[PDB]
Each structure stands twice: as structure tokens, then as C-alpha cells.
Design a protein around this ligand. Structure first.
Ligand SMILES: CN(CCOc1ccc(C[C@@H]2SC(=O)NC2=O)cc1)c1ccccn1
Ligand SMILES: CCCCCCCC/C=C/CCCCCCCC(=O)O
Length: 258
């Protein structure tokens, strides 16, 4: 019954709000000019970068920026982990599979929600207090200058779908519930959950976006864009492990990366 699916949608939305302090609706109001939120400080060069610390509370610069993304992904992983536990049935699955769904789901989710913080020209940072331009990121030196560009490219295409947070909450849950992750022990109870999430997503997109033809199909097709984003990024991490042997990846992050 649709009623059961609407209640699942409400539930997931509610946990989403509770686990992610910076929603897309807040990101959007910061990026456009609404009076509900306050304007960010903009970092577009190395000198405004240094003024960013005397205003916002935040070793060559490209490295230090990179340590900033590191720290933020660790935080996102913590938030995603908190959100996963709220998805009905997730905590009743085998503990090894729970680790496995998170291990592979977490980055596809990060890049999905990172799109919420992006327009074609840059990305919100520091809980929306800052805005780091796309071009300042693309001008970083040799290995670092091109770690964000693919994420911007995805976000521009993904943001065209015009999903709002109640859409994303269900979509994020579908991602984490992927029974095709390598090494899963009991694929079948995972798929039963994902099939219920997919029904909830489908209904949600139909009621929330009644005029957007086949949005459901186009949203799932976006799942291959995420997969390729993850693969390019880990090959880029393997370059930096060797060219800066003096730099430390956060242990939560290197465990996710196998
Ligand atoms: C560009 N931003 C926003 C965060 O944007 C992100 C970019 C990449 C990732 C994936 C990380 S990157 C890494 O080192 N390993 C991962 O899993 C996660 C977030 C900055 C920049 C400076 C300070 C704070 N925020
Ligand atoms: C969901 C995608 C994960 C990345 C969100 C983007 C965060 C930008 C950089 C943040 C610096 C990390 C310190 C805490 C600030 C949270 C930032 C934010 O959510 O805007």
C-alpha cells in the first residue's frame, strides 16, 4: 500500500534531517541570496584563502586544502553511518554485511550530497560559512588540481534533476542497501530492504515531481556516474601515497579504501 511507503518516506526524511546538519535546502538558500541564511566568505585565490581563517574557523596550501577534505569526509562518514542505522532493517543485518554496505556505500553517498553544496562555480565549505571556487581548486599543483573537477562535473548533471532533501533521503538509503557489493554474506535480506526503498523512492518521485517524466529511471542511471567518480578518486589517492610519503590518510578513510 502507498500509505506504508509514504510513512517510510516520512521516516527516512526525518532521520535525514536529524543526521545531516547542512541540508540541500540550507545549501541552496546560502548559494542564492535568501534572507533565511547568511552569505559565505569566498576563497578564490591564495590571499583570500589566508583571510578565510581570520573570519571562519578552519605545509603547502594544496596539501592543507586536501587535509581539509579528508577531515570533512571523516565527518560525513560519521553522519552517513548515523543515518544508515535509522534505515529499517539495517541494524538487524549481519554485522559483517553492515560494515560491507557502509564501506562501499559511503563514498557514492558523499559525492551525491556534495552536489547539494555545489553550483557550477564552486562548493560550500565549513558548514556553509565558506565558498571555495571551482577554479581555485582546479589551479592547485600537479596531483591535487584535478581531484574536484569530476565531482563538479557530476554535480552539474545531478543538480539538473532538481531533487530536494526528501528525495535524497530515500535515494541515499537505496545506495547503502546495494546487495551487489563484493563480499556480502546474505544478499537476500539486503535486497528485500532495497526493493522496499525503491518502491518508496518511486512513489516519492511521482508525488513530489509529478511532471518530471521518468525521473525515477534517470535517478537510478546516475548510479553509474557515482561509481566512476569513486574509481578515479582512489587511483588519484594511489598517486599521492607515493609522491608525498610524509602525508597521512585518516585511518577511518584508509580502512574504507581496499
Ligand atoms: C573542497 N572542500 C569540501 C569537501 O569536498 C570533498 C572533497 C572530496 C571528498 C572525498 C575525500 S577526499 C580525501 O582525501 N579522501 C575522501 O574520501 C570529500 C569532500 C573543502 C575544502 C577545504 C576545507 C574543507 N572542505
Ligand atoms: C555530503 C558531502 C560531504 C562534503 C560536504 C562539504 C563540506 C565542505 C567542507 C567542510 C569542512 C569540514 C569541517 C566541517 C564543515 C562542514 C562543511 C559543510 O557541510 O559545508
Amino acid at each position: 500500500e502507498s500509505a506504508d511507503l509514504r510513512a517510510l518516506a516520512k521516516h527516512l526524511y526525518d532521520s535525514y534531517i536529524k543526521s545531516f546538519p547542512l541540508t540541500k535546502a540550507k545549501a541552496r538558500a546560502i548559494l542564492t541570496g535568501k534572507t533565511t541564511d547568511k552569505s559565505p566568505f569566498v576563497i578564490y585565490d591564495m590571499n583570500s584563502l589566508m583571510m578565510g581563517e581570520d573570519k571562519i574557523k578552519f605545509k603547502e596550501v594544496a596539501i592543507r586544502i586536501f587535509q581539509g577534505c579528508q577531515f570533512r569526509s571523516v565527518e560525513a562518514v560519521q553522519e552517513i553511518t548515523e543515518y544508515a542505522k535509522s534505515i529499517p532493517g539495517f541494524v538487524n543485518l549481519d554485522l559483517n554485511d553492515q560494515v560491507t554496505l557502509l564501506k562501499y556505500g559511503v563514498h557514492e553517498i558523499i559525492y551525491t550530497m556534495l552536489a547539494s553544496l555545489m553550483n557550477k562555480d564552486g562548493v560550500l565549505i565549513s558548514e556553509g560559512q565558506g565558498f571555495m571556487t571551482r577554479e581555485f581548486l582546479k589551479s592547485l599543483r600537479k596531483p591535487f588540481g584535478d581531484f574536484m573537477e569530476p565531482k563538479f562535473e557530476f554535480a552539474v548533471k545531478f543538480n539538473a534533476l532538481e531533487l530536494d532533501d526528501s528525495d535524497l533521503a530515500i535515494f541515499i538509503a537505496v545506495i547503502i542497501l546495494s546487495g551487489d557489493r563484493p563480499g556480502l554474506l546474505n544478499v537476500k535480506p539486503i535486497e528485500d530492504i532495497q526493493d522496499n526503498l525503491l518502491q518508496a523512492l518511486e512513489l516519492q518521485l511521482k508525488l513530489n515531481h509529478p511532471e518530471s517524466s521518468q525521473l525515477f529511471a534517470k535517478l537510478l542511471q546516475k548510479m553509474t556516474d557515482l561509481r566512476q567518480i569513486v574509481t578515479e578518486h582512489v587511483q588519484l589517492l594511489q598517486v599521492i601515497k607515493k609522491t608525498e610519503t610524509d602525508m597521512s590518510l585518516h585511518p577511518l578513510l584508509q580502512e574504507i579504501y581496499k
